[PDB]
Amino acid sequence: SPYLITGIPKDPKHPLPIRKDIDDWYLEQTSRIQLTLFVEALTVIQNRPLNDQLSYFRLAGIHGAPWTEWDGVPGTGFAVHNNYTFPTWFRVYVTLYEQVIYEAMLDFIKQNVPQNGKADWENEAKQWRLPYWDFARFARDELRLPILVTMPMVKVLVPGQPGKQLSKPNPLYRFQMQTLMGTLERPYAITDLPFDKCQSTTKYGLLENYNADVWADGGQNWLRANLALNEHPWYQNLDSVPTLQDMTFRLLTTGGLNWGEFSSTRYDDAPKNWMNLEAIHNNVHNWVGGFMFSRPGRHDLKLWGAGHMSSVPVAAYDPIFWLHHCNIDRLTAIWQTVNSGSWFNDDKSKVSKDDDLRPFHRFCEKTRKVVFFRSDDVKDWRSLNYDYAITKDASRIRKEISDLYGEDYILSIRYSRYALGGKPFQINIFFGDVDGKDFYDARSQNFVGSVFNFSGAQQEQEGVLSVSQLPARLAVHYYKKQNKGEVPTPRYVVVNSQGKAEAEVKVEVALHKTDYRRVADGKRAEVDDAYRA
Amino acid sequence: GPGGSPYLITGIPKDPKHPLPIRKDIDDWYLEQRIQLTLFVEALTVIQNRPLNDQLSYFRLAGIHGAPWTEWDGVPGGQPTGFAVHNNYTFPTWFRVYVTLYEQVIYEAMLDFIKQNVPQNGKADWENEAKQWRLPYWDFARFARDELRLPILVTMPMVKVLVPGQPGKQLSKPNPLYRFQMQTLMGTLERPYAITSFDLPFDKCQSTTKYGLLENYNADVWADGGQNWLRANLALNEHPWYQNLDGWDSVPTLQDMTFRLLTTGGLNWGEFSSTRYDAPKNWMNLEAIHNNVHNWVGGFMFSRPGRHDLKLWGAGHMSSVPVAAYDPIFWLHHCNIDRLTAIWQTVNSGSWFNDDKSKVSKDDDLRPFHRFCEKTRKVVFFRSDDVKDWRSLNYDYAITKDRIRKEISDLYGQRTKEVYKDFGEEDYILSIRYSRYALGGKPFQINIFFGDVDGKDFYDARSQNFVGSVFNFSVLSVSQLPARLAVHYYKKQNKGEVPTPRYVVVNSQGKAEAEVKVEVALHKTEGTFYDDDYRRVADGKRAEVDDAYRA
Ligand SMILES: [O-][O-]
Ligand SMILES: [Cu+2]
Ligand SMILES: [Cu+2]
């Protein structure tokens, strides 16, 4: 310490290497030196001890729990949420992860590759960059978690044993410790959802009413995550379009937003410009991990279940976290490319531009001193010696955006992250009557879409709230069709981690129509008595 | 076998300090735990990690049942058919011996683990636990501690064990009951053991899976498709569709079937022991219930036509005769099938290969299982009479130690009685007769409906008007389904009319097979079954489905 974050060092045989789509990269590798390097290096990092600040646990620990120091910066986590430095704090955080993995790759080569092959393996390490998960791209008819994340094991090369491939536990599948995270040595223990009783990260694996020993490793219910990722209005199960892809398309193609509007859910005391990067990212966290531990009533089919990615304090432990944030960085770079003058340039985000991005250090070549990273340091992501295919070929970026992700009606949503004292919740919006026992997801009658509060005696910063936006065109057309042309009143339910409706929460929900005009104000829907909080 | 001599199956040898130890319910056994848990985990881990040339490896022991159809213990294989008996009256007795073999191998591995690992101070106490341990059973028909479930242990990827010589120290280790994993894809094992019979990509699996094989995912996902135990639980709790409507109480069909099986009097051995068919009231048999559980644990449909966000299909080893024995739950399932056989024997004491059909098979050699014949001084194969009394293999069940009819009702009959008592004193059953070879040996599922069938959704309890299923796990074959509650519901919606049973034969692609013959009928008696003259009241008919869903 300090650990200087630089990105992977420049090598002239490797001009601005790209971060590839992880599904494309996995298929290239198997259709495997880089795959071996990534698997082996990430395994080594996951097995480093807690007192090593470049262990996987400690790197994930920068984000949230267990809220310790990192790199000599005293330990809420370090992560930036609901502020305009969300994209840039995470830009540096993803680069730290990438850089540590690359360093571990070089160590792996020194340890395991014979002298005669070191140049070949080093070539591959120097070309590798952290792949991104394209959560909004149809997987090589539907959106999906990465192929590699759904694989318990992965086959790798053994250097010096040509045609000596071997199957190993996949470090992208889960992060597993040797004991329950609640029992780790001080001060690293993780001690709402029983994350203290988990040894491994899980997706939808934590459900009430099963033995607590099941929670030690609740499994990776990637089929369930995929279903959530493809959320869309209920009626489309009677032509569907996944809302996540439409939201991403709109984020990338809508012109005229300032940085403050694009960068964050933060609303400091319009609606057309409330589709923002952070809100989409919050929904993806919910969809990957699950946040509901139980459901009232009797149900044969159990669609709930909770996991690490839905929860701010522990989401960073799931290896997909980094791949998600890699794409969030990619989306930022794309938006920057097509909105090149909009950088901390509005009267709301300007104040935050010079925030130190603690705990991340760099060397100042002007002061000749170690300082914290600041947003302007990473405005050009290529300064960190990586790029994306889509931003290298800028000339045709609009066409590529259309090929990947392509009156109007929109829903606006304004809410307090601390409406429940800081606990997470999901805002579900419906057109028409709400089923008092089924108000949760796309299988719930009349469901149109959700907004997840990715948060987790406590109140928000004075004057600050949070915003999101949902597409509503197709769902309003269906509703009119079934309802004699009535413009629907949006109905909402605020759902907590017990699958109950929090009657006392008020959210501002409105429907707007195209220049957008407000055409209906939303109202809370009642649910059954056994389903009320 | 090992050494180059036959492997003699004895069951765990008798020790006078250990009189007829019981096979416990695996959830109860787990919940009270922890030396026996440690011994079972460490021994089974060693057995699973044994090399393919070792005939007491997990792979080769599973290999006896089906694929890859090799020899075992000097007995030629390559019959493709395995050594297992299916659709014949020796089904319960062949499996009785098979389960005992597994149990004996585990016990012997426990003794070796103690010899290599346990300090002098603890050896006699660990030896005493090995001698008291017997293979637990999975009670698939008992409510878990409102619903049927896979065992707790089967759903845990890791398990904490003791470390001998390190007091109070425990280590979390991969749970050998969660899955069986090899070091490579089973399709590329060293000859002759490759798994390569079947249409699902089992050749592309390195590990066993529950509901994890689906079309349209990268083939490397199939190497280990995972354990979707929540989905398997859902399947295990199959019941008529109408019971998920508000204002109606549900009963798990599996529990109703098992209570019927155990309580119905007057079956001969041939009716009880097998699906084999060469009065429909007597067609509820052990093998048919076992077949449905195989399906519900593993999943058999790889695909479904059309577009579906919620994907309720998926295939896994337990549904597939050639590879089912590789899933560790297989043995726990078959341990309960042995227990159900012992219960039924206890309450049907004269009914042992007692009919003209089964008498023919009573003397069949149960290959490949050897034992030493003390009266002729020869190593011979097991025969059914050798295992008529399961206690001769030095194990027992708590339920067979005495009161049995009351235990059967307490365990399997309370929910059925509670809901049936709400309706009139009548019973309805469905009879189902099919040919196991109707699809060339390919497996298939027979779903029955009362009322109109949704031509895009004819699959499971979520399918409109679904009544129940019969699974062809694989002379004719028969099964029976409870129908009393579904008939009541249909009558209330149809001004008293008796429903025509409608059936669909579904293949592994989720498509309807139109040339698979199934004989379905609905039968009625006055009086409730648990308190006898059944008459046919309706003939079945094949349901049509949407054109895109037709095979
Ligand atoms: O019968 O497996
Ligand atoms: Cu975060
Ligand atoms: Cu995040």
Ligand SMILES: [Cu+2]
């Ligand atoms: Cu079998």
Ligand SMILES: [Cu+2]
């Ligand atoms: Cu079986």
